[PDB]
């Protein structure tokens, strides 16, 4: 769930 | 009469001891933090004594879990108020977040952003000191759906979780582009598979109007030119703002800490919804907005004489040193033999040729130290922090005050990232700086 | 030599007592179930004594939680082996599913489909009786991502959850349709917001090839004609099949229970992946495949002389009688005053003008009773069940053997839904029937 | 189609075993109760295994606490749905009422009127049987202030307690009587002692208008003729009625059980607020209203073809046999030596010359048995119960069907008490009777 | 608290 | 998470 | 219960 995110 | 100093910092992804090394530049960072009235950071790790179960967080880059002893590293370094709302607080589920609250309260560490229910996650925490009080509110725009906390109902309890700042993205498309999307919907048979939902709900859930469309789990709107817009969830925005107005009545300073990975048109710009959010927070009476998430620095904005730090990056970055890797995390790396954690991170980054290691922006940080007099910002010092780019994996990620040459480069970066907001910076001989203020 | 009978049924959404009324047709259903060697149902409700926290399950139609006393209603009615993998077993989270396992084991109820880890959820349960043994495996293709159970790693425990059957959907689009999608991606600025992921991962995660595309969280493939395909997750399919081959060595009969809401080209047809899955199960040695999810009946298929019941609908349907509605569920209904549960369900369905109440297909059911002799299917009796369409909300949803006229209509429905598979049905004077077998 | 029978009874003050004696008239009462679909009583005693602490309940006649084994006496006698809201449920405090809920749930006894919070105390309980379901709601107009349950707030939990029906009394006085009351207020110095409250609140809390007055903790209103009026608390009345409308959607029958000691103009008439309450309950859809409290019978009213039993007295009366007397209860009896419980009750009643023992009205009871067909009252049988007036203290208070002669006298009493409501009674040869119905 | 209640 | 599922 | 008391 992030669409267009690491750590 | 009332004079208070607040240190700000970004993601604290601590997984090992010895956070402050014997390097004089690292000891001077601790002296800096321990010399302020309040020192805020974003606890970007689940401290654990064993409670809970790992959630599948591949989007977040894997689980981020550490021995609870790292909390003593955080406090001994000088951090004294923790923001906890982020995309990793729920890495051990609802039981994990209850375990974190137990660990923080037993160590007397003020924290905000998580709770046993939604109200408890939204509440400010009040940190009281002889010179005055600071209210910290903590929310996150980046998390797995369902991880937000929930309030109780008359019949069921709440749900432990994080303080959410939800947002929606809308794709602006031309009328001819919209027609092709509807055509694809009909011709693939996708529309036929919603025939049941049409009878049960009474209408097509994909038809929000004749110029609006919900397809493929995405919002489309007809517009004269293609574009992309983001907007805060009105309920989250009104509720967080509601608690900011509450906190302003009960503390000298109100700081809002917001976790946000979402990029704007470019990776260094914040999402438009984040900028609307930050403006609203100061409109409601917040004295500062500290952002984090992207693991690199973003610009700084002065709005109504209060600072917005859209991203302070990482203050501690020890992801690759974690000793607690879940089975689903291991499965992302093909292996002809069972993997140890360090070998897993070596293969995950292609032995250091991708992910965060090769790029220097992920290993520079910034610690602002703000001075307020009766709620008026009178100084905003900027202390560049070096996280050891290019050092061995077991050494990089621990923070120290950058030397002059590297601090000047970081200060240039902040100035350039802040230029679109009209922010100016004065630069000291040692590479530290401060914002130019109108007061 | 070995002769065993198995009763099958669909969703058991029980929230109240008195499951079997004093109606003779309801008592004869209990007599039917209690006369078989094994009677299987899908426990589509969280029985609870208070452990866990409600999850946001708006997609699933709200939380489905009931007093643990309903388990005594299930067993006294005659059900003796429970399938638990479905989109509601996790309605109280990981703590809730551990509470369910505690409740079932303390009552001596064999169950499958959930576990403290992934292996425990995949395992068959063995129900032993004097005449022989049945192995039940239970999986679900419908659930919120992350609710699947997880196996432990060398450093972290597993995660309690359900036995998953994941699947991917691919949109087949023409080359000109694919070009418009890429154009929308570039012109809206959506591609620009992946610039960071390009540097970190080394490539665009949206480029899976020049004729393949991942946009808007959906898979697109260039094809000569538009279309829609679904495929089982290869790991789930191989692993469930692996456990079926294990169960076939240790039990007389192996039954696979699969929860699947996913529609095919039409609401009454199963997803293509479900049909591939069911064929694989029998290929691996299963004696029957019982499906459920859609709340209406689907067709019946005979494959290699074993029956596939793609959907037996609901055997108990008391959603609107639940006394445990979560705060997020209440929020889906605008109200100028706090709502009681019954009033909430009245407003949610528009006082009965939408959702499941108006349509008769949601209140007919079917209980197959299968007879096996040394693993060979020798009879497949069909007993239509009436759930009380049009009765008051507090009465409908309790099962009884349908009277002759309604049973004949239900049997016609099953025959028509099964006709595309070449299934034929013999019809008794009382409205019950049986499949025409080749044996 | 749906035919259900409900037995009603008053206060069940059970403190000893052997509730049903070997007397054939007592065994026939158990047969009567166990032959109905539902048998309701008011649990007027705290069953306890030791949890909680005694509250000062001198107004209620002392603490009423018994071994939890008395619950097996209640169920074996035939009672199957318990009303728990009364002036004694809180005799062991909040911990005691939580202990009662634990004891009832572990024995599988449906109950209403108490809860861990206000909503749980207001909720109906649903008792399901093969022939249909009954919803019981239970409230009390007699209790010590503060004993009502409380709902949670965003920051604090609720409070365990009872379901309240509060009410206010207003004294109507002439204008010259009102002037004397104000004069007494001023001349005694009582008004001077409210000078602080005047400055803090801004006005005199005793001035509710020029013709209204709050003095001595009592409401006074100017009227042309002296009088006395009582009125339900609008919030309790609206909320209980709200839950009755909810229960009517989810059960065949809705019964409201209300505890009320408050007398009307005469001891045998109910308070006017109670009559307004009972009418409202039936207006909202209740099928019967069963009252209790005074320990003697009151009249029966038929309102919109539903019965109101304003008081069924005691069905079990063993106050003087309790073995758990608190220190504050003992202090009400002057003694030159420490007292045993039985000697304490002997001295409290003046060796039987006062309190309930001398008067026969306190030892007659009535068990109505109502028959409903699809919610329509089709029969209301009246079974007089004898509690053993004049027998030794260890024998009286256990119920049995009265013999013919005593049953006829009790039936005459009920008819006379019900005459002001227009109720008529048919009388059987055995002294039992039934209400004359319009249906 | 009963104003103008035994057992 | 259902893509193209009540109760 | 105070007859003729805040905080
Ligand atoms: Ca993050
Ligand atoms: Ca389902
Ligand atoms: Ca009483
Ligand atoms: Ca005080």
Numbering used by the authors:
A (entry chain B), E (entry chain B), F (entry chain B), G (entry chain B): 12 to 15, 19 to 21
B (entry chain A), C (entry chain A), D (entry chain A): 1 to 439
Task: Show me the paper's own sentences about this structure.
In a manner similar to the MslH:MslAΔTrp21 structure, the MslH:MslA Trp21G structure accommodated the MslA Trp21G molecule, consisting of the Gly12-Tyr15 and Cys19-Gly21 parts on the C-terminal side of MslA Trp21G with a disulfide bond between Cys13 and Cys19, in the large cleft. In addition, the amide nitrogen and oxygen atoms between Phe20 and Gly21 in MslA Trp21G formed polar interactions with the oxygen atom in the backbone of MslH Gly60 and the nitrogen atom of the His295 side chain, respectively (2.6 Å and 2.5 Å). Because the amide bond was recognized by MslH in a similar manner to the carboxyl group of the C-terminal MslA Phe20, the electron densities of MslA analogues likely represented the binding mode of the original MslA substrate in MslH. The structure analyses also revealed that the C-terminal MslA Phe20 carboxyl group in MslAΔTrp21 and the C-terminal MslA Phe20 and Gly21 in MslA Trp21G are located near a hydrophobic pocket consisting of MslH Gly60-62 and Leu64 on the core domain and Ile319, Tyr345, Leu348, Leu355, and Phe356 on the C-domain in monomer A at the edge of the cleft, respectively. In addition, an architecture that would construct a six-coordination motif, consisting of four amino acid residues Glu44, Asn87, His259, and His261 and two water molecules (w1 and w2), was detected around the C-terminal carboxyl group of MslA Phe20 in the MslH:MslAΔTrp21 crystal structure.
Herein, based on X-ray crystallographic studies in association with MslA core peptide analogues, we show that MslH is a metallo-dependent peptide epimerase with a calcineurin-like fold.
